């Protein structure tokens, strides 16, 4: 199957094993892991983190040919499970000095949920990209501003976690793959750049 492929020692995911618009299991609710959690979904994980940081450096992605990722879920890799990747850098400063923390979000999330979240909508000013999706897709995906989260780690601990900005945004977008859900659901249908007053467009 799918899993057996993706969890080979020697195997690094990449681009061949995401799998594209149209394929059903984008499309499914995916099914909640449990614990303690097998070894395949251990791996998996810790695979899911690896084409992230891969993505994220510009000589293994050239080397592997991957677009530049900030999450990742698990359906996207035709596993229909609650498992999502999530890494979000810091940037430089304009001296070109490291941030103090290299991530502002470094996590793989086990049936990761929002269990509350803001009135106030935000959405990215540059949209989003999707991994599965070859077609260029404009306009505001219009996603709840604050968001409280609850999820599990691999050990099995359970977190609870408020976001904002950007790693709102990630983390509904990818919550969004394990429920079937697609950001371009979240595009006004007639104006794909309406905006709501209130809106908060994140630059
Ligand atoms: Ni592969
Ligand atoms: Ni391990
Ligand atoms: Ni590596
Ligand atoms: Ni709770
Ligand atoms: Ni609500
Ligand atoms: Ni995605
Ligand atoms: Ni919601
Ligand atoms: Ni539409």
Same mark, same amino acid.
């Given at each position: 199957?799918?899993?057996?492929?993706?969890?080979?020692?020697?195997?690094?995911?990449?681009?061949?094993?995401?799998?594209?618009?149209?394929?059903?299991?984008?499309?499914?609710?995916? $099914?909640?892991?449990?614990?303690?959690?097998?070894?395949?979904?251990?791996?998996?994980?810790?695979?899911?983190?690896?084409?992230?940081?891969?993505?994220?450096?510009?000589?293994?992605? +050239?080397?592997?040919?991957?677009?530049?990722? @900030?999450?990742?879920?698990?359906?996207?890799?035709?596993?229909?499970?609650?498992?999502?990747?999530?890494?979000?850098?810091? @940037? +430089?400063?304009?001296?070109?000095?490291?941030?103090?923390?290299?991530?502002?979000?470094?996590?793989?999330?086990?049936?990761?949920?929002? @269990?509350?979240?803001?009135?106030?909508?935000?959405?990215?000013?540059?949209?989003?990209?999707?991994?599965?999706?070859?077609?260029?897709?404009?306009?505001?995906?219009?996603?709840?501003?604050? @968001?409280?989260?609850?999820?599990?780690?691999?050990?099995? $601990?359970?977190?609870?976690?408020?976001?904002?900005?950007?790693?709102?945004?990630?983390?509904?977008? $990818?919550?969004?793959?394990?429920?079937?859900?697609?950001?371009?659901?979240?595009?006004?249908?007639?104006?794909?750049?309406?905006?709501?007053?209130?809106?908060?467009?994140?630059?």
């Amino acid at each position: 199957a799918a899993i057996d492929k993706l969890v080979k020692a020697s195997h690094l995911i990449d681009m061949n094993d995401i799998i594209r618009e149209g394929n059903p299991t984008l499309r499914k609710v995916a $099914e909640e892991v449990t614990f303690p959690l097998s070894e395949k979904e251990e791996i998996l994980g810790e695979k899911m983190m690896q084409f992230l940081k891969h993505s994220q450096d510009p000589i293994m992605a +050239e080397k592997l040919g991957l677009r530049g990722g @900030v999450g990742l879920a698990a359906p996207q890799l035709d596993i229909s499970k609650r498992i999502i990747a999530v890494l979000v850098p810091n @940037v +430089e400063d304009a001296q070109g000095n490291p941030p103090k923390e290299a991530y502002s979000l470094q996590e793989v999330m086990y049936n990761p949920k929002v @269990v509350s979240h803001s009135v106030q909508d935000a959405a990215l000013s540059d949209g989003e990209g999707c991994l599965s999706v070859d077609r260029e897709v404009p306009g505001y995906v219009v996603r709840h501003a604050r @968001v409280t989260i609850e999820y599990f780690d691999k050990t099995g $601990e359970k977190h609870r976690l408020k976001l904002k900005g950007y790693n709102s945004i990630v983390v509904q977008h $990818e919550i969004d793959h394990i429920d079937g859900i697609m950001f371009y659901d979240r595009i006004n249908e007639k104006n794909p750049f309406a905006v709501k007053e209130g809106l908060l467009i994140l630059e």
